[PDB]
């Protein structure tokens, strides 16, 4: 349905907003900041 796709888009936008504002905190959460980095 078109409704479900509109909700996908608005949730997609809120997710990107959250990431862009907390990108460093989430990188502590994730363990690294570059994909070229060893993960652990």
């Amino acid at each position: 349905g078109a409704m479900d796709k509109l909700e996908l888009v608005n949730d997609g936008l809120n997710i990107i907003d959250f990431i862009q504002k907390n990108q460093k905190e989430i990188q502590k959460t994730y363990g690294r900041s570059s994909i070229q980095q060893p993960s652990i």
Binding site: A2, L6, N10, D11, I15, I16, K24, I26, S34, I35
Partner: protein, 330 residues
Amino acid sequence: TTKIRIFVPATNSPELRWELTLFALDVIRSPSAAESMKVGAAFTLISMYSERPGALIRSLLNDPDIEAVIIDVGSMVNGIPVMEQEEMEGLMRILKTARDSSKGKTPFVDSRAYGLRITDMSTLVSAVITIEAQIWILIAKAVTAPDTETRRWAKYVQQKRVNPFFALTQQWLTEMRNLLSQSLSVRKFMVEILIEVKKGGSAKGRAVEIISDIGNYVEETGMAGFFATIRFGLETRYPALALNEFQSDLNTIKSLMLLYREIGPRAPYMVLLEESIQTKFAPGGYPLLWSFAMGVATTIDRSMGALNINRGYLEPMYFRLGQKSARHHA
């Protein structure tokens, strides 16, 4: 601007519409018809399902690169519209050359269809839908990549929604498909009908059924990478999205997502419009996020197996990262 002559039936008369339909068929296969006449005949065919085709075209024509002179046709003499001159003579040359041109062939696989007199409403509808369905199907194999047939037409037949008697020859359909490829206007107007049908508001049930089927196929196909990316790359909310390398792809897909919101229904049908926007939402514009999303999808969803294959933009390092992130979140 570039004027376009569009002949339109003035009545619900089955016989008038059937001869008018045949004439339009003939213009498109005609050697001495200007591309402007052929464009008009496409409008005539594409709108023939509606109660009032001239009114359909006027209300929905949103296109600056063309001026439509819609011409009401109250009756046919010798297979050509009656006009209310040399202009009459021209429309004869269009039939004669269309006819003489080909090896006695008609636009129809069963030539009997070409000589047929229709006076019953349900036979007109059936013939008109069957012809229109085959034109819309051209639109369907255009949006796909040629990386795939007839399952389309065959489905409609077993479903009895289409009448195999009114099947068009390959030579005719190639004429039509050429016209679609070369003419932004016809596609643009078809896009209007796809939007109009989705809305919708007409009682031509069987027509808008088949147009919806196409319309929905065009949407699903062209936005499939976009929404898979959002659904499997964004919605899953994996912390790997905060890696520096994803940030430009995040900008891109944010711009695309805002686009989708302000354009509306027109957005999925961009794949049928001007060349430079056909690939607006294509995943090749955000390929690392796309590859990441692919890696998640094929890991967690049993319907997404197709995405294991590189169609050109797959970035193995980001695909693997998707698999790993999906395996890590149970």
